[PDB]
Structures are given as C-alpha cells and as structure tokens.
Design a protein around this ligand. Structure first.
Ligand SMILES: [Mg+2]
Ligand SMILES: [Mg+2]
Ligand SMILES: [Mg+2]
Ligand SMILES: [Mg+2]
Ligand SMILES: [Mg+2]
Ligand SMILES: [Mg+2]
Ligand SMILES: [Mg+2]
Ligand SMILES: [Mg+2]
Ligand SMILES: [Mg+2]
Ligand SMILES: [Mg+2]
Ligand SMILES: [Mg+2]
Ligand SMILES: [Mg+2]
Ligand SMILES: [Mg+2]
Ligand SMILES: [Mg+2]
Ligand SMILES: [Mg+2]
Ligand SMILES: [Mg+2]
Ligand SMILES: [Mg+2]
Ligand SMILES: [Mg+2]
Ligand SMILES: [Mg+2]
Ligand SMILES: [Mg+2]
Ligand SMILES: [Mg+2]
Ligand SMILES: [Mg+2]
Ligand SMILES: [Mg+2]
Ligand SMILES: [Mg+2]
Ligand SMILES: [Mg+2]
Ligand SMILES: [Mg+2]
Ligand SMILES: [Mg+2]
Ligand SMILES: [Mg+2]
Ligand SMILES: [Mg+2]
Ligand SMILES: [Mg+2]
Ligand SMILES: [Mg+2]
Ligand SMILES: [Mg+2]
Ligand SMILES: [Mg+2]
Ligand SMILES: [Mg+2]
Ligand SMILES: [Mg+2]
Ligand SMILES: [Mg+2]
Ligand SMILES: [Mg+2]
Ligand SMILES: [Mg+2]
Ligand SMILES: [Mg+2]
Ligand SMILES: [Mg+2]
Ligand SMILES: [Mg+2]
Ligand SMILES: [Mg+2]
Ligand SMILES: [Mg+2]
Ligand SMILES: [Mg+2]
Ligand SMILES: [Mg+2]
Ligand SMILES: [Mg+2]
Ligand SMILES: [Mg+2]
Ligand SMILES: [Mg+2]
Ligand SMILES: [Mg+2]
Ligand SMILES: [Mg+2]
Ligand SMILES: [Mg+2]
Ligand SMILES: [Mg+2]
Ligand SMILES: [Mg+2]
Ligand SMILES: [Mg+2]
Ligand SMILES: [Mg+2]
Ligand SMILES: [Mg+2]
Ligand SMILES: [Mg+2]
Ligand SMILES: [Mg+2]
Ligand SMILES: [Mg+2]
Ligand SMILES: [Mg+2]
Ligand SMILES: [Mg+2]
Ligand SMILES: [Mg+2]
Ligand SMILES: [Mg+2]
Ligand SMILES: [Mg+2]
Ligand SMILES: [Mg+2]
Lengths: 210, 147
RNA sequence: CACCCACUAAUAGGGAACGUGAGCUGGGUUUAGACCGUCGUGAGACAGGUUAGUUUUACCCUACUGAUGAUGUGUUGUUGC
RNA sequence: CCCACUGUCCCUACCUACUAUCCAGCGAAACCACAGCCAAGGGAACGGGCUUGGCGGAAUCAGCGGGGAAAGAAGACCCUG
RNA sequence: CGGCGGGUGUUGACGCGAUGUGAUUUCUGCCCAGUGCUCUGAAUGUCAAAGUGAAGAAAUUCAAUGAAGCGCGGGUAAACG
RNA sequence: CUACGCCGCGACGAGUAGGAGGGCCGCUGCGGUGAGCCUUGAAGCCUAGGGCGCGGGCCCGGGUGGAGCCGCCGCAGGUGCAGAUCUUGGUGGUAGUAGCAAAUAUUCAAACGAGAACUUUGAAGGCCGAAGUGGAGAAGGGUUCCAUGUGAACAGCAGUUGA
RNA sequence: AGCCCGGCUCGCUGGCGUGGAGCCGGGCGUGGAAUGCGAGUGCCUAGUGGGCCACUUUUGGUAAGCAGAACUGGCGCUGCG
RNA sequence: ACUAAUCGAACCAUCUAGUAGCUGGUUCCCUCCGAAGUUUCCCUCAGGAUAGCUGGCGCUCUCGCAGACCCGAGCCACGCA
RNA sequence: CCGACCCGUCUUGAAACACGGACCAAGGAGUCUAACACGUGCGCGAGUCGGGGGCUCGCACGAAAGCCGCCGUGGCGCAAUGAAGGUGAAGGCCGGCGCGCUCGCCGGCCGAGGUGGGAUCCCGAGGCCUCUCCAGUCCGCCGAGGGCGCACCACCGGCCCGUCUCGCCCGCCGCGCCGGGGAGGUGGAGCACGAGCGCACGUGUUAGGACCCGAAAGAUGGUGAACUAUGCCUGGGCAGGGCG
RNA sequence: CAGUAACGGCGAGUGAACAGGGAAGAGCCCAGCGCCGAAUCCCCGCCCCGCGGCGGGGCGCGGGACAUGUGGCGUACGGAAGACCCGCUCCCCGGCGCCGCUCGUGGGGGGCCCAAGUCCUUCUGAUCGAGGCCCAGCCCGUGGACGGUGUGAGGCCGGUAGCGGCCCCCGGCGCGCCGGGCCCGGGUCUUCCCGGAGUCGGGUUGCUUGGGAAUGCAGCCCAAAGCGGGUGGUAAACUCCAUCUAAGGCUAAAUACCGGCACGAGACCGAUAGUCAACAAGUACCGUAAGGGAAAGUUGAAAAGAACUUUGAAGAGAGAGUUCAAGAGGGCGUGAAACCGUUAAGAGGUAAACGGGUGGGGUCCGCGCAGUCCGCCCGGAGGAUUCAACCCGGCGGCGGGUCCGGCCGUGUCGGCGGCCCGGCGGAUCUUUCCCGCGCGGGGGACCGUCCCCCGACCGGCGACCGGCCGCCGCCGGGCGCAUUUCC
C-alpha cells in the first residue's frame, strides 16, 4: 500500500529471481586467472607484441561519437592494396585484416596506409632459419633491439588541431548562425513539396495558352 | 549493525510496534500498486497526477544517439579553454580573438544563459541559440558553424 | 396443551439453566436412504405429510449417602447428660 | 384391533453365575492456571476465589451422579470471507 | 492423443444399442399453444471463409452470388409436460 | 576542570496502542588493547555466605569441577521467552487407582529345584464330543522344527517352563 | 502593515486639475481595552479508523442495561480516598 | 456405494515456505512524550487509502544573560489566546 | 495487623460460567537482498564516483591493500519546456536621434531588479571614570538614533518553453505556403551567480517465503483391484424333513 | 545503454537492441561454373621398416566404390586461363645424440631426507607451567604455520622455510643427419566464368516476442526472380539511395558448472545446532507399492576395567585394591531444573501463594568484645647522620638587544644560476635553423607552478634547536659535629 508521498516503484522481483543469482566471489580469482593467461601468452609469443596485431584507425559510427576515433577490427583490403601488403602475408607478419570493411572517404584510407607504412618501418622480421638470413633483417638490429612490446601496437590517439587566435573579419561578424540554421531546416523540410509545386506550375505553364 | 535497530528495543513488547488491534498482517490493501484507481485512488491522485492514460505519439526503435546534443551556456563558455588563453586574449594588443571549440570540449549547442566578458571570441559549435548568437556578437565575437 | 371416562375431600396454579440425557428413553424436531403433494427448466427446496435411522467417559475435587478414625480429659473402661 | 400369554405394570421380592469388594503379585490412561463448603450482592447481566454474612478440624474407605456452565472436537446450526 | 485404430462383433433386426414403466387382471381420457425431437426444401429471408466482378496507384472499399444452422411449413405426449 | 567534565537555581513526574533516548544491562564471534587471569585450578554448576545497582544485572566468599576464560575501545549478528491446542526431551498428581471377569474345573501325592497354584510324573474329577480343543495340507511365515543349557530382559501373576 | 501632509505614474475611468490603484519622500510613540502566555516555521512519521458511559438537549420505540444524534467531561489508557 | 481402516474425486512426491483483509504468538531494563475509534473515497461494512489525533529531528526569531560579594539606575519583547 | 481474584489475549467491558496454559529444560518469531524517500555523519565539491577492466613476488594474512587518468566509457548532477517538429533562461542608469510614436540604431558604466520584514555587523549625538579643578592627550563600557543587510518569508517586476489574442517591422547566395522579432493573458515538475556526487548509519514504504505457524483448494508426474466393485478362466462346496 | 524505446483489462505488471568502454580475438571449406586421359577412395593377399593407440614404403593382368561424378585448382575478400615483367625466396611430417636445461625461477607425477634445550632449580598424577641461562644477553630462525606427545612446546616428534639435496618415470621446445613426400609466388594487361527452390515471398491459423496494421517459429494454401532477392521498427503505390548476398558446412579463446576426482580456506554451526546422517545412516523401522525415514558423541594419561575374603541361588552388597580422582566403575567428562527418598529446623481448622510493617527463632558475617587515626605544638627521657650558610661538579626551568649560530614564515631584488648544466604542466606562440605534400612529427621561445642556490631587508626564537651569560631550583661529593636537623 502507498504511504504518503513517494515514488511509484516497480520491482522486477515477481519471477522467482533467487534461483538465478550470479554472485561475484570468484571475481578476484577470475582476474588472477586472466592475468596468468596473459602472461603465459606473452611468454609463448616471445618477441611478438603481447597485445597482438596492429589495429586500424577507425571513426566511431553515430552522431554521438563521430568526433572520436578508436581502434578497428582489421585493415581493409583497399588499405593493404595501396600499401603494398598481401592480404595473406599481413596476418603472418602481424597485421589484422578486415575483408568486410570498406573505405568511403580518402582521408581515413590515407591515415590507415600511413599507419601501415609506419608499422612496416618499425617491424623487425626474424628469418625462418637463424643461421640463414634470407630477406628478413640484419642481425645487428635484431640481436638486442628485439623486445616484446607492451600495450597496443601504436595506440590510437585522438588528435586536436589547435587554431591560433586570429582577427575576426567583417564577414564572420555579419554571418547569422541562428538564421542560417533555421533557414537550412526549413529548406530541407520543404524541398520536396517545393519541387512538386514547381512541377505543377510548369505543367500549367506549358499549356496555359490554348 | 543489527544492534542499532528497533528490533533490539522491541523485545518484551508483544506486538513488536505494530499494534494490538490492527496487528501486522500479510497484505492488507493489496500487493504492490494494487487498487490505484479504486481504493488507493486518493493517494495516487494526490501524489502522482498524470499516472493513468496515454499522451502523445509513440515512436518505435528510439536511438538516443541520434538526439544526442549536449548544451553549454555562455556563462560557462570560457571555462572550456585555459586561463592562459583568456588572459592572453584580454591583454592582447591586437584584436586577435581566441577560438573555442565546444564540439572539442564535448558540447554541440551553445545556449545563451548568463553574460560574457567584454572581449571578442570565435565560437565553433554545431548549433547556436538566438540569444547566444546575439550575446556573442555583442562582445564583438563571431559564431561559426561546424558539422 | 387439549378432550373424554371413572374415582375422589380435592382432582389448584407455578419455580428450580422453559429443574432433572457421564439419570434413562428417543416418540418429536434436526444429517446422510426413500416415497407423495406443491414449487423449480434443472440441480434442488418446502415451521407440508410419511418411513428407517450409533444417545460415548467418572477411578478426580466437592456435594450427598453411609463407614473407619482424629483433637482434648495421664491410660483405659462402664454408665450417662 | 382381538384370543392366548405373561413381572411391561400394580409392586416389588428371592435365588444362581461372573464382577464390583478385601488381599498377594502386576499395573495404565483421560484430564490438570491455581484449586475446590455455602447465601446474597455487585460484576462480561448464573462465583470456588471478590464484598457482606453463614462458618471452617488431620488421614481416609465403599457408593453416587447435583455441580466443577466436567471431559471428549479450533461448532457440523447461523452469519462473515 | 494418434493410425480407416478399437468395443458391441465368433454379431445382422426373433440382433445390437438407448430410454421409461414395473408380475397378473382391468384400463391408460383431452392438449402439438410452450420447450424439445423429427420430416420437407418450395419460390424461399438471413447467413462465414473461399471464390467472382467493379472502383482505386495500391493497401482497401463496394457489389453480385448464397452451405449448414436459424426463420418459414408439417408430424409427434407409453417426449418433457 | 574524565569541558562527552564539574557546579548552581527553578519548575515538573499517571499511562495502553505508539514514538524516541540512555544503558559501566546481557549473549556469541572478529580487529585492537589489558607485559590481563589460569593445573598454587578456567568454563559450567550448587550455596540458610557478604554486598552493590531504581532496574536490566554484577562483584566477592564456600563447595564441586578439571582447561580454558575475561575487562576496556571499536566491529558483526542465527543476540535476551511464560505463553503460540508452539517443537523435542524429561517428569508429576491422578495412583499402588482403573483394571488383570467371553467360551463349566479343578484336586491329591511325589520328583527336580534355593524357590512350585502354574514344570514333570502318577491318581482322581471334568471338557472338546468326529461340522473336534483330533489327524494332515494350500496361501502366508522363515528356522518358529529337534536336543542341550541359562534364568538377565520378554511370555501384562509366576515359572524349575517357553514359539 | 496606523494616521496625516505633500509629490510622481497609469495604456483603467473620465465634463473636470475626475475617480481609483500603485509608487516616492516627510512628520507624528500617550505602543491607543482587561487578563495571561515566549512565538513562528519545515521535514519524516507510527498507532488508530469496532468504542462505550454520565449531566443536559434530543429522534424512533410501550419500554429497554434498546437503537440513533448534539455539547462537555470521563472510561477505554487510570492508580488513589 | 466401492476403488488397501482414505472417496461428492484414492494414495505418493513435487510446484510449495501456495494465498489468507481471518485466528494464535511475537523474547532485556530505566527515562521522556503520548493517542484513535472521526472526515472523504473505495464490490467498502472484520480491510485500505486520505485528513485528523502522536512522536522524533530540527531550524528562524524574542527577553536578556550584567555588575568579581553587593548594587535598577510617559517608557518597559517579536507575537499568541 | 492491614492490603490482596490468575496470568497471557481479543475486547466498550475479563477474576470470569470466554479461549491457551499440569510441571521443567533446551529451541522458538521484523531477517537478508533490491529499489525508493527523508534525516544524520564523512570526503570532495560544479563536480563527483572506478563499482567493470588493467598493472603490481599470484596466494600466511592478501579473495586484502596500493595504483591507473588518453582506463571517466559511463552514471548522477550542471536546463527546461512541448505530443512533436523544435525551441531554449540578464537586466538597471546617464544620453544624444527617427517622432525616445509606450518604440527602432549605438555609446559609457555596472552586472540578476525592487518593496516590507530580517540574526549579525558598521557609524553614532550623548553618558559611565580617579583628591578637585580652567586644559587636551590614548584607548574600555552603556547608548537615543541612523546605515549596509545573510539565510528565509510575503509580495511586485523580469527571463526560458507550450498555447491563445492583437499588430507592425526586419533578414537573404535559396524571395519563400521561407526565417526572425513585439505587446498582452495564460499552461510548465523552469531561470533569476549552482549543490551535487560517492560512502556509511537510522527510520518508513514496497517486491521477494518477507515477523513466525496455519487452510478448504489448484497443477504436474507416478504407485495401487493383497480389501472391495464388476466381467472372464479354472477349481471346490451346500444335513434332515414338508408340499406334491 | 536501461527499468529506457516499447508491450500491457495502457491495470497489475512486463521490457530489449544500437552506438560506447573492456575480456578474448582467428579465420575458413564445399556444392555450383570450369579445366585436368578418375588425376580419387575402400578392402584383401605378399615383402620390408616399425608395434604400443596400429602407421609408412613398395608389389598384385588382386577385388570393389565411382561418369546417377571421386580428387586437384577454386568460393563472392572475386576466380580461372593466356601472355609481359619481377622475385627463387624454403613446407610440414616421425626418430638418432645433446645443449638453453621445459622456466617467477622442476614442466609434470612419485619416493626418501635436511636447524635449534628434553640444560639448572622448582609445580604436578603427568607436565608443554614458573624462575634462570655472564659475554646484550640459552640455541635455531629464509624455519615463532599446524598437529601429536600424560597441561598450555619455535628448539621431544612429524612437519614448517629454502631459485634445498638425492633417486625413478613421463611430456613438448634447436642444431647435423635420417625415410620419404613437397610444387611457383607476386604485379600489369587481355579473354572468359560466377552461385544453394516447395526455398524466398504472400495469405491465413496457432503459439511466441518489447516488436506495436503482426518480432520470431510452425501447420495449411498459393508459390517466385535474376540490373534479382533480403533489410532499411506504421499498412500501401511511385521514386531515389544505403546495406548485405538467404534457402550448404566447419572453427579455439574470453563464458557456465548445487554432479564427479583432488585440494585450500572461513568474523559460519558446534551434537534438539551444522547435511537426514560427527556413530555398523539413506541404517533401523514403516508402507503392497510409489515412497517415508530416525534416535544415537565423551571412563581414564594409561585398563591400571576392581585380585582376594565374605553373605546370598543369583541380581546385588560389605570389605580390600588401582588411580590424582571411581563423590571417573564399560551408555562411565561436568552433572541444572521439574519430580522423589531421607535427615534437620519451623509451622499447620478459613486451599496455597503474594505486597507493606514489625516481632520471635535460626544459620552465618563483622579478627565486635575495652575501640580508630594523623598534622602541628608543649613537656620528658634516648640516638644519629649531619641543619642552615659556603666550595666543587652535574642536570633542569626561565630570560637575553640575537648577545653568536642554526634558522623559520612572508614578501624582494639580479636570475650567475635549468629543456647541454634541476623538474612538471599550458586550448600560449613558432622551422620563418630539422627528416613527411606549398600539407605532419621534433626541436625552440613564452607563460604558470617549481626546484635547490648565491645573498640582503621585515617579524620571531616560536611550542624547530644549540653555544654563551644572568637568575632560580634540584641532586652528588666536601666543610659545617651541635641551643641546628632528623628518627
Ligand atoms: Mg508500550
Ligand atoms: Mg509474552
Ligand atoms: Mg468500484
Ligand atoms: Mg430444560
Ligand atoms: Mg445432568
Ligand atoms: Mg445421553
Ligand atoms: Mg426417531
Ligand atoms: Mg432424512
Ligand atoms: Mg431398521
Ligand atoms: Mg474400586
Ligand atoms: Mg454461591
Ligand atoms: Mg470456530
Ligand atoms: Mg471447524
Ligand atoms: Mg425393462
Ligand atoms: Mg396419457
Ligand atoms: Mg440456408
Ligand atoms: Mg396427438
Ligand atoms: Mg511517565
Ligand atoms: Mg533467533
Ligand atoms: Mg519455556
Ligand atoms: Mg483394583
Ligand atoms: Mg477383574
Ligand atoms: Mg462332553
Ligand atoms: Mg484340524
Ligand atoms: Mg520347540
Ligand atoms: Mg510376568
Ligand atoms: Mg478493526
Ligand atoms: Mg446508546
Ligand atoms: Mg482497546
Ligand atoms: Mg487521556
Ligand atoms: Mg482515574
Ligand atoms: Mg502452508
Ligand atoms: Mg477480531
Ligand atoms: Mg484471545
Ligand atoms: Mg463482546
Ligand atoms: Mg485477563
Ligand atoms: Mg461470568
Ligand atoms: Mg467454553
Ligand atoms: Mg477464540
Ligand atoms: Mg486447556
Ligand atoms: Mg503446552
Ligand atoms: Mg531459551
Ligand atoms: Mg584492489
Ligand atoms: Mg562522456
Ligand atoms: Mg530583502
Ligand atoms: Mg513575481
Ligand atoms: Mg515515506
Ligand atoms: Mg511464513
Ligand atoms: Mg482455480
Ligand atoms: Mg482379487
Ligand atoms: Mg538512468
Ligand atoms: Mg514475459
Ligand atoms: Mg583486448
Ligand atoms: Mg569437382
Ligand atoms: Mg626437528
Ligand atoms: Mg600440544
Ligand atoms: Mg608445538
Ligand atoms: Mg619442503
Ligand atoms: Mg515507414
Ligand atoms: Mg543432528
Ligand atoms: Mg550437550
Ligand atoms: Mg533379577
Ligand atoms: Mg574428581
Ligand atoms: Mg558422570
Ligand atoms: Mg530434600
């Protein structure tokens, strides 16, 4: 029964909830097990980076997040093609590939291919037979310069272009931002019906004289 | 701490603070929000008006991200840059005005509450309100739009 | 309750948890079976009729009925008021 | 309803067996606020307790069915949900 | 639950199945308005889905057609009554 | 003058349901602390022993006991019982009472034996009376069958007897 | 927060410098009955939501320790003479 | 009627600690404050919500805090009943 | 000697001829989770919070504690209003101008208005002093009046969003069934120089077994015809007399 | 995200997804279309190498499957075939011998071992208790977890710590070799080839979902297309756009775990509790069955478990004995209450019991029984360092222009002092000196906090401290040995 002022509450506890209760007493144990697995994997892939393959620079989808940028699943085939890396050799040398990702614009394409070229420059390649260095790398730069990389490879970072203070011009002072926004909304709203009315007026015009 | 509760003081009193006449029974009045239109109608009308009925248009598959548009007021506008920026602009001999990117700071619309200090500034925003634009123009600034 | 027969001095009226069921009886009402009449579409109902239908315990306390005893007169007995 | 028959009755009596009874042995249960003498008063309008009076004498035995509104069952009647 | 499954049925109207009344004797009267049951579809009214036609750009709308049943018409009380 | 302390003055004091405060009231366990207590005797229990507090309760003496226990500052509860025809266990009155009364019946002597109404043997008097209280099976039981021994418990008295 | 002087505003009202309302300055304390008392204000909130009785007023009823109202007090919740 | 002492729907386990506006119970001490059986609405009349009555937490203010012993040196608080 | 009926409970009313209670011991009933609301304590504060993850000899304690900061994603708060499209919270004075037309173009200032109350604070004429005086040195107390007024209250204005009524202007890379603005009412859980966030505790309400015990019932899946009811199969049994 | 969009007698109630941040991260294979002399696969005999999960190689005018389609290439990310150019780039499989010894320090499994008091004196039935152990303190400690042992034990024993030791077995990591397989990769151009049907979709019905003119699933009816089809959260027509490519298949990790095997732990319970079950417990027992289902721990350190005598037929007693204790005697630790027996005291006709007030008796308590103490002074009779004041030494307290330092707080100057030779930050400006198209990352300058410094001025010695003085106080050692001082 309600009692004086209060919030109308609707608990979702009518469905025998006590048979399905997930306690978290194994959370510290799970963290320990995950850390042990991470360390074992890092030991298994000894000089290779612990986090794994390099990931592409990827802009977040919706209008809420399109100002941010993050790491994607894998580099696109167009990026690999213009960077000169085979799509079957990239995974061997540690480059994640995403065959189902497309490149709508050219700026993201170019950013990801400079990322690929920078990674390829920073890559140290061990020959299959250490006694027979065929085409990988010189032994000088892989004897002591080889080191397991901790953290994501070339972590994706949001960059901000700083604009220096400048003199405001008369055109910028005379721009009407609110009026422009209102008129743009009105034009986008009435674009179709204006076209239909113009079409009807043209129909009347092409036969007004008879 | 169970030692700080009324149960430790209600030992020895037969009804445990629930009365001898009305007692403490299972569910007098119903369970939950029962009888909100019949025998709890006075409580519901008194404290939760508008509770019953439908108002407005329903919209399937609402995506909050589409309508995401955080706002910032002009009184908090200058807090988005460093103090160095404002003092340098104030003491600048030339009429150079700093650029404030509220989209960079995480805001899409600039609202017009408050007042601005008397110094020009360029403001980059997705949307502006009419009074915000007027107050920015008043101090000799400019409003520029971004997408 | 009633009514009649007969006797009689008279056949007055009442109470006691409408005295009295671990006192009885169980004829009546008032379970379950069943029949009739009326009512109800029906299941079924009827201060309407009819028939058949388990009446358990006292050894406790008191009361009462009887039966030993108890206190005092040193013990004990007889006769007594 | 009639004949016959008879202790159904007038109107009760006597006898027999087994008990009950007393003893040796053996040995429960129901029930139990505390308990247990009355009259009147008042009181939840029928008291064992309270008030006012009557009064009150250990421990017991055999019976008894007036009381304990006795025991047995969270009334089956009636109403409410 | 289901299978062309099973019982009556190793049966066939002097047989199976469903009712009422209750030996024999003597009788079993009137009522088909009501509610049931049943016979006939006769132009027939209503009547779902599907199908048909039309309008529309389509969704859709409308119209035409018209199965049982119900209405309409007979029978029936050892059907309820 | 533990200032969460101490001191002064004035008025006031009923209480169900209910609310609040205080508890140096009480139980159990944890973190600290008492250079705490204890086989020269812990807990528990008993006590015509001495006291303290309005009270919840607590301290000390004596006895029993034989290995653990407590104060203070915080923390945490499965934390306080007279009731629930409460649950489990134990024990009274009733009460040495009701009762050991369906189917006629026992008696004498002897033996064994510590012990005989009940066992065994003999004698007598009775009963079942062949549709049996007789002689044998089915189902069911499962060793109850047979011999020897015992007299704890059981055979609602007893037993020297017994399924 | 009273009274009395001036002055200003009004798009209301209007013969009128009218009326009304508001606003702005200024001056008036004998604090404009008695008595008593320190007031104002917010949040959260339990229990209760069967009542009963008495004086008096009062409705129904022959009446009721009946049923129903008004006022105050009480019992409930309260001991004491 | 009977269906393993169970029948107007057996027994066993589980859903299940089913629900109950109804009955019963509800565990230490002291101190302070202290009720209601009334209003309105409810398939409401043995129950709730609601206002009232209660408690707790406060907060905003008023009289001043007087002379180190002592000693006042027309006018005597916001406001309330 | 005086006083003293048996407790618990429901009840207007219990000592009741109202119910439970023979006695004793042990057990025995408002709990935990979640979500709210308000109050209180703590930290930080227009912010706050790492709770999920990760890094640290992996582990007696330690399943703890510590740290992250381009792990603050995100939650809550910092903005409301409208069904929605959407829109979205600064005014007061001195002026020169159209015509200061109840209004349009700018300057200079200041920065959420005003009235009435308002703790506190400030100024303060005049008083209080010693062995006394004509003459000023330093500060202490009382003080009529006056001033700035916190929080909060009442009121009047102002601003934002919705919706009506009236009406006239303005803008343009789209001259539009375009966009913007005003005045006067009215609807809002608004603004009007933030108060929240996290943690803990208490109380109250609620969903959960929900203070403890309690139905008559309902559902699912199994076990029973050793009793009984009935059908079938295969066995067994029933003196002596009368009527005729 | 979010108790949100939405569903809901729009009531009670129900209720996702996308984006974002993380844990983990892995991709692929057919059919078809095609090309390749079926290139393919199974079985059976023979030989050799092997056994340890039965494989490898070779042989068979040996069988069979298979053109009603095996294998190789190839799969939507396109693919194939030709040319032209460029690069030879190096794969996996099972052993032989051994390293780095597998690795947070053994990789796993098993076995056996590794410090130090039973020292002295005492308590006790027994002690693991108590006191001590000169050298800074008994000994070890990388071991002071735990358990056992007649208490309570780091050193008595097992263990515990330790990148401690030894032995046995098993598994995967590189090199040289071994047996054999193993067949070309990329770019450009040209020519070709490209897809899953009673399926999608539509109607209807039923269930389901938050899915609302119908989210998903299924039954029935209809029944496809190929610039096609699906989706684009309101039914429909036209139109543009976006996105994917259904009706075939496989795939580790992050995730779940009240059963099982083996472990570790706990602010949990402590024999009516905790599992029903601490024990011959799913046992005894109950029911025809399905099924239901308990109660029940403790002598003692050690049985040392009462020899023997005596009465009785025995149970059972009286002695004796063991033990620290049988006032621990085989359901035996302790041993409450209810209830009962006996003893002692008191009392008794208004049932007991109770409150207040006394009185009597009784058991105990009070070291009760000649009643306290202690400060000063007076008087008496005795002792003794030594009383005061001075000297020396030590230590404290207080004060001192800072006497002298050490400094401390707040400012104030030149920055000599730091992006080489001091930091950290800035939504502040830049090469107009430096490596990426006139388009980045560095390096600089400036600013803010700084840092230690060279020094000075202001306030102060502060509760941040020292040295000197001055005063005072205390203590120790002298002298003071008597009208002082003390007992
Ligand atoms: Mg109370
Ligand atoms: Mg009680
Ligand atoms: Mg209603
Ligand atoms: Mg009678
Ligand atoms: Mg009687
Ligand atoms: Mg009777
Ligand atoms: Mg009768
Ligand atoms: Mg009858
Ligand atoms: Mg009969
Ligand atoms: Mg008798
Ligand atoms: Mg009487
Ligand atoms: Mg009843
Ligand atoms: Mg009943
Ligand atoms: Mg017949
Ligand atoms: Mg007839
Ligand atoms: Mg028809
Ligand atoms: Mg006829
Ligand atoms: Mg009181
Ligand atoms: Mg409890
Ligand atoms: Mg009890
Ligand atoms: Mg007898
Ligand atoms: Mg007898
Ligand atoms: Mg005979
Ligand atoms: Mg026989
Ligand atoms: Mg025998
Ligand atoms: Mg016997
Ligand atoms: Mg009530
Ligand atoms: Mg009345
Ligand atoms: Mg009451
Ligand atoms: Mg009162
Ligand atoms: Mg009174
Ligand atoms: Mg139940
Ligand atoms: Mg009631
Ligand atoms: Mg009651
Ligand atoms: Mg009553
Ligand atoms: Mg009572
Ligand atoms: Mg009575
Ligand atoms: Mg009764
Ligand atoms: Mg009752
Ligand atoms: Mg009773
Ligand atoms: Mg009881
Ligand atoms: Mg208890
Ligand atoms: Mg942590
Ligand atoms: Mg964010
Ligand atoms: Mg004000
Ligand atoms: Mg206002
Ligand atoms: Mg509340
Ligand atoms: Mg319950
Ligand atoms: Mg139902
Ligand atoms: Mg049978
Ligand atoms: Mg939220
Ligand atoms: Mg659901
Ligand atoms: Mg990751
Ligand atoms: Mg092929
Ligand atoms: Mg050792
Ligand atoms: Mg030990
Ligand atoms: Mg040890
Ligand atoms: Mg070891
Ligand atoms: Mg749409
Ligand atoms: Mg147990
Ligand atoms: Mg015990
Ligand atoms: Mg014996
Ligand atoms: Mg002993
Ligand atoms: Mg014992
Ligand atoms: Mg005794």
């Amino acid at each position: 029964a309600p009692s004086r002022n209060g919030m109308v509450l609707k608990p979702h506890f009518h469905k025998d909830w006590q048979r399905r209760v997930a306690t978290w007493f194994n959370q510290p144990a799970r963290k320990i097990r995950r850390r042990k697995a991470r360390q074992a994997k890092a030991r298994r892939i000894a000089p290779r980076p612990a986090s794994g393959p390099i990931r592409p620079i990827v802009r977040c989808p919706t209008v809420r997040y399109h100002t941010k940028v993050r790491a994607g699943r894998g580099f696109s085939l167009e990026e690999l093609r213009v960077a000169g890396i085979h799509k079957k050799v990239a995974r061997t040398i540690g480059i994640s590939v995403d065959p189902r990702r497309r490149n709508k614009s050219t700026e993201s394409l170019q950013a990801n291919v400079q990322r690929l070229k920078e990674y390829r420059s920073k890559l140290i390649l061990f020959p299959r037979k250490p006694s027979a260095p065929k085409k990988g790398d010189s032994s000088a730069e892989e004897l002591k310069l080889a080191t397991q990389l901790t953290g994501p490879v070339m972590p994706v970072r949001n960059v901000y272009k700083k604009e220096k203070a400048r003199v405001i011009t008369e055109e910028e002072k005379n721009f009407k931002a609110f009026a422009s926004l209102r008129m743009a909304r009105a034009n986008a709203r009435l674009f179709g019906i204006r076209a239909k009315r113009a079409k009807e007026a043209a129909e009347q015009d092409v036969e007004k004289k008879k | 701490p169970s030692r700080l509760r009324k149960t430790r003081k209600l030992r020895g009193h037969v009804s445990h603070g629930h009365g001898r006449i009305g007692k403490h029974r299972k569910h007098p009045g119903g369970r939950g929000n029962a009888g909100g239109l019949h025998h709890h109608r006075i409580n519901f009308d008194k404290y939760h008006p508008g509770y019953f009925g439908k108002v407005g248009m329903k919209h399937y598959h609402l995506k909050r991200n589409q309508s995401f548009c955080p706002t910032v007021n002009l009184d908090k506008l200058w807090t988005l840059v460093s103090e160095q920026t404002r003092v340098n602009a104030a003491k600048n001999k030339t009429g150079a005005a700093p650029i404030i990117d509220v989209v960079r700071s995480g805001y899409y619309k600039v609202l017009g509450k408050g007042k601005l200090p008397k110094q020009p500034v360029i403001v980059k925003a997705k949307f502006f309100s009419r009074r915000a634009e007027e107050k920015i123009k008043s101090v000799g600034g400019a409003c520029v739009l971004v997408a």
